[PDB]
Enzyme design. Structure first.
Site, PDB file in Angstrom:
ATOM      1  N   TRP B 100       0.817  -1.221   0.000  1.00 25.82           N
ATOM      2  CA  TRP B 100       0.000   0.000   0.000  1.00 25.82           C
ATOM      3  C   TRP B 100       0.856   1.278   0.000  1.00 25.82           C
ATOM      4  O   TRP B 100       0.492   2.283  -0.618  1.00 25.82           O
ATOM      5  CB  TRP B 100      -1.018  -0.062   1.156  1.00 25.82           C
ATOM      6  CG  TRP B 100      -2.083  -1.097   0.914  1.00 25.82           C
ATOM      7  CD1 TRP B 100      -2.326  -2.208   1.661  1.00 25.82           C
ATOM      8  CD2 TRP B 100      -3.046  -1.063  -0.149  1.00 25.82           C
ATOM      9  NE1 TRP B 100      -3.392  -2.910   1.123  1.00 25.82           N
ATOM     10  CE2 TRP B 100      -3.836  -2.203   0.004  1.00 25.82           C
ATOM     11  CE3 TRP B 100      -3.294  -0.181  -1.225  1.00 25.82           C
ATOM     12  CZ2 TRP B 100      -4.875  -2.479  -0.878  1.00 25.82           C
ATOM     13  CZ3 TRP B 100      -4.328  -0.476  -2.098  1.00 25.82           C
ATOM     14  CH2 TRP B 100      -5.103  -1.607  -1.928  1.00 25.82           C
ATOM     15  N   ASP B 170      -1.684   6.919   5.915  1.00 24.38           N
ATOM     16  CA  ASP B 170      -2.713   5.989   5.472  1.00 24.38           C
ATOM     17  C   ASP B 170      -2.948   5.018   6.608  1.00 24.38           C
ATOM     18  O   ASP B 170      -2.155   4.109   6.828  1.00 24.38           O
ATOM     19  CB  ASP B 170      -2.275   5.271   4.203  1.00 24.38           C
ATOM     20  CG  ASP B 170      -3.214   4.214   3.723  1.00 24.38           C
ATOM     21  OD1 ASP B 170      -4.296   4.018   4.345  1.00 24.38           O
ATOM     22  OD2 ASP B 170      -2.916   3.577   2.691  1.00 24.38           O
ATOM     23  N   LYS B 194     -12.558  -1.246   7.057  1.00 23.74           N
ATOM     24  CA  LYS B 194     -11.810  -2.172   7.914  1.00 23.74           C
ATOM     25  C   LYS B 194     -12.214  -1.979   9.362  1.00 23.74           C
ATOM     26  O   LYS B 194     -12.566  -2.997   9.992  1.00 23.74           O
ATOM     27  CB  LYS B 194     -10.307  -1.987   7.597  1.00 23.74           C
ATOM     28  CG  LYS B 194     -10.099  -2.511   6.183  1.00 23.74           C
ATOM     29  CD  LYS B 194      -8.871  -2.023   5.437  1.00 23.74           C
ATOM     30  CE  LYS B 194      -8.872  -2.591   4.049  1.00 23.74           C
ATOM     31  NZ  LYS B 194      -7.716  -2.254   3.113  1.00 23.74           N
TER      32      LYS B 194
HETATM   33  C1  LIG Z   1      -7.585  -1.424   1.835  1.00 25.80           C
HETATM   34  C2  LIG Z   1      -6.360  -0.474   1.822  1.00 25.80           C
HETATM   35  C3  LIG Z   1      -6.286   0.573   0.908  1.00 25.80           C
HETATM   36  C4  LIG Z   1      -7.221   0.642  -0.340  1.00 25.80           C
HETATM   37  O1  LIG Z   1      -8.496   1.163   0.036  1.00 25.80           O
HETATM   38  P1  LIG Z   1      -9.669   1.413  -1.080  1.00 25.80           P
HETATM   39  O2  LIG Z   1     -10.780   1.984  -0.257  1.00 25.80           O
HETATM   40  O3  LIG Z   1      -9.944   0.066  -1.654  1.00 25.80           O
HETATM   41  O4  LIG Z   1      -9.083   2.363  -2.070  1.00 25.80           O
HETATM   42  C5  LIG Z   1      -5.354   1.538   1.037  1.00 25.80           C
HETATM   43  N1  LIG Z   1      -4.460   1.488   2.072  1.00 25.80           N
HETATM   44  C6  LIG Z   1      -4.458   0.433   2.942  1.00 25.80           C
HETATM   45  C7  LIG Z   1      -3.404   0.451   4.049  1.00 25.80           C
HETATM   46  C8  LIG Z   1      -5.417  -0.542   2.827  1.00 25.80           C
HETATM   47  O5  LIG Z   1      -5.440  -1.524   3.787  1.00 25.80           O
HETATM   48 CL   LIG Z   2       0.874  -3.585   2.727  1.00 26.91          CL
HETATM   49 CL   LIG Z   3      -5.117  -5.580   1.591  1.00 28.76          CL
END
Ligand SMILES: *Cc1c(COP(=O)(O)O)cnc(C)c1O
Ligand SMILES: [Cl-]
Ligand SMILES: [Cl-]
Ligand SMILES: *Cc1c(COP(=O)(O)O)cnc(C)c1O
Ligand SMILES: [Cl-]
Ligand SMILES: [Cl-]
Ligand SMILES: [Mg+2]
Ligand SMILES: [Mg+2]
Ligand SMILES: [Mg+2]
Ligand SMILES: [Mg+2]
Ligand SMILES: [Mg+2]
Lengths: 358, 355
Positions: B100, B170, B194
């Site tokens: 990510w 993030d 999440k």
């Molecule tokens: C799931 C995830 C994303 C992607 O999120 P979307 O809503 O699908 O764009 C980005 N960063 C992390 C750390 C993730 O776990």
């Molecule tokens: Cl990751």
């Molecule tokens: Cl993931």
């Protein structure tokens, strides 16, 4: 008693909501909500595909078009469209038929050359211009229209035949309210929350070969090609909104599809327009008769005191959403697909009684 | 029996879903669903505001930060951030701690100069790099980190003290799983799906005074700040569900209480790995282990597949590792209950015993 004339988000068909309620905790025998599933699960993939397949059947979408489910609203499409198609040397050409048309034009202006093919702005957007008025350019990247001008209550009766550039339409407030010849268009977009259910998803119907190519310099998420290639699963989709969209489309199909819903929509619009037209000027519609929307009925009383008193009485009586858009005032009865006919009958009765008692 | 270890979207609290079910047709005596309300209605505005208020309370977000509710996922934030802050002559500086992080860096590279402050990519993202190793630049626009590396199962234990540029994180896979000192950051963002809610809304916590001529209206933070995330139609049901989840976290005692639960969940799975005499091996260095995503493998791919098949047969959902890395991944976000983790342990112990 509650009568839901909200303009966006708006009334949903009760069976779609009752279905969602019943299976909210245990979807497709999984013992999870659709909201708790992976977008890569078979159960979700089936929903995602069925929503596409229902739209395809109901609108008779040809096989060289793809159906995208995007986040961001129609407002994000106002910028994503010129980002992908308004290339150097070309022009984003717009037909202005209301405020939403203006908002789309504004975003294109930030990205390239624009033009106004035709406009009824000077007359406060009471009508759709005649197609013979349209000023077209050889280097148009597209011609963009707004099929239903949600704030002003006017609507295209039919669509122009454009051969020099793709025809693009913001159909947010009238998509799947009637049959449509999709092959007139290069792209159609609509936030779902007026006529297709949920906020949080935008339906984009795209001619694949116009938009499936990488565009130099454009961020990944803002390329149509990204979403076309990944079938709208590039990142995590708005799964509950797409599920609700599926449920609403199942309802439209059950009731007889686009042709049947057009018949229903014409009937319930006629209840309200006849009330206006029989009112001897006590209610005045904004739209010229030939351009009257079947989806948003806009009107005023003779002065603002009466407008206020009518709207206050409506609210007391259980009507929701009738205040006009802030930018224009007056009244707006939004009568999208799922608004029941008895709400329109009730509105007529309110309108007649208020007139008689004034 | 079903045990929901999905990695995103994910398990939600039963009380939040039950509440949503009960009132799905008649919200707050309006005789409409929350989905049928105008977003300019007092009825919806109250919910919108309450979601913000509960986040503010639960994360102790100072008044000089604003709470935005956006569409597009964390992935749109990968471009929106540099679009707003990576201005000419400045650098978008990234700490790479998993896939990510790489995806975020990639989007910045399209828009300006980038840099890698630190990276554990060469060792397959087994750890968070030492802060003393970070290579910082005077003209950094920001320093971006990924707090929880969802695919690799690693997590920041604490956060660096950055004052030459704003720290941006993030936090998609660990937001509101524990208390946070929001003053360490210029911006935090997270898809809701999440730890906060269903997919379709993205939470962005931004220092107001941090945040652009030529940027499209919808892609300016300023647009959303000035309009209180009501510039266009928000994802009303997703924000409602977020509110419900936040009420559940508050009712259990807030961020410290959920952290204790999450530490106990993670302990069950890591103790099972650690006591397994090498039958299960975690990917993460112990000091970097995530409390949110537990990544591990068995001694060969055949056994990995046998284990995952048995789990699926016994009602476990979501345990397959990300495709890019293989193995197993137990996602144990806030609403995954401790009994599911106990059940996973017991499956893991039986599987080893019968191997
Ligand atoms: C799931 C995830 C994303 C992607 O999120 P979307 O809503 O699908 O764009 C980005 N960063 C992390 C750390 C993730 O776990
Ligand atoms: Cl990751
Ligand atoms: Cl993931
Ligand atoms: C409401 C509406 C929009 C704006 O949609 P969002 O999803 O709020 O961005 C755009 N076009 C028309 C015609 C609309 O009615
Ligand atoms: Cl309009
Ligand atoms: Cl509107
Ligand atoms: Mg049917
Ligand atoms: Mg009835
Ligand atoms: Mg690792
Ligand atoms: Mg409470
Ligand atoms: Mg021990």
């Amino acid at each position: 008693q509650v009568f839901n004339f909200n303009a966006g988000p708006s009334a949903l068909p009760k069976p779609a909501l009752e279905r969602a309620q019943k299976e909210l905790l245990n979807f497709n025998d999984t013992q999870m909500s659709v909201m708790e599933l992976s977008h890569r699960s078979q159960s979700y993939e089936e929903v995602h595909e069925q929503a596409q397949n229902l739209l395809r059947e109901l609108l008779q979408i040809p096989n060289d078009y793809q159906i995208l489910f995007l986040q961001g609203g129609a407002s994000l499409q106002f910028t994503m469209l010129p980002m992908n198609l308004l290339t150097k040397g070309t022009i984003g050409n717009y037909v202005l038929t209301g405020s939403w048309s203006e908002k789309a034009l504004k975003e294109a202006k930030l990205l390239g050359e624009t033009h106004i093919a035709a406009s009824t702005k000077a007359n406060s957007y009471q009508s759709i211009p005649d197609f013979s008025e349209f000023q077209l350019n050889e280097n148009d990247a597209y011609l963009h229209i707004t099929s239903n001008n949600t704030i002003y209550g006017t609507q295209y009766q039919n669509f122009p035949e454009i051969n020099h550039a793709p025809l693009i339409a913001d159909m947010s407030s009238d998509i799947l309210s009637r049959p449509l010849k999709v092959n007139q268009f290069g792209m159609i977009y609509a936030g779902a929350q007026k006529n297709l259910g949920p906020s949080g998803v935008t339906v984009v119907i795209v001619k694949k070969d116009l938009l499936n190519t990488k565009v130099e310099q454009v961020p990944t998420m803002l390329q149509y090609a990204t979403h076309i290639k990944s079938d709208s699963l590039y990142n995590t989709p708005p799964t509950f909104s797409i599920y609700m969209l599926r449920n609403v489309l199942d309802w439209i199909k059950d009731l007889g599809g686009a042709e049947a819903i057009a018949k229903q929509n014409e009937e319930k619009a006629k209840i309200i327009y006849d009330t206006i037209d029989e009112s001897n000027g006590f209610y005045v519609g904004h739209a010229e008769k030939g351009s009257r929307s079947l989806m948003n009925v806009t009107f005023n009383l003779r002065n603002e005191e009466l407008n206020q008193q009518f709207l206050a009485k409506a609210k007391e009586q259980g009507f929701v959403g009738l205040n006009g858009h802030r930018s224009v005032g007056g009244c707006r009865a939004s009568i999208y697909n799922a608004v029941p006919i008895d709400a329109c009958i009730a509105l007529r009765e309110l309108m007649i009684q208020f007139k008689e008692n004034a």
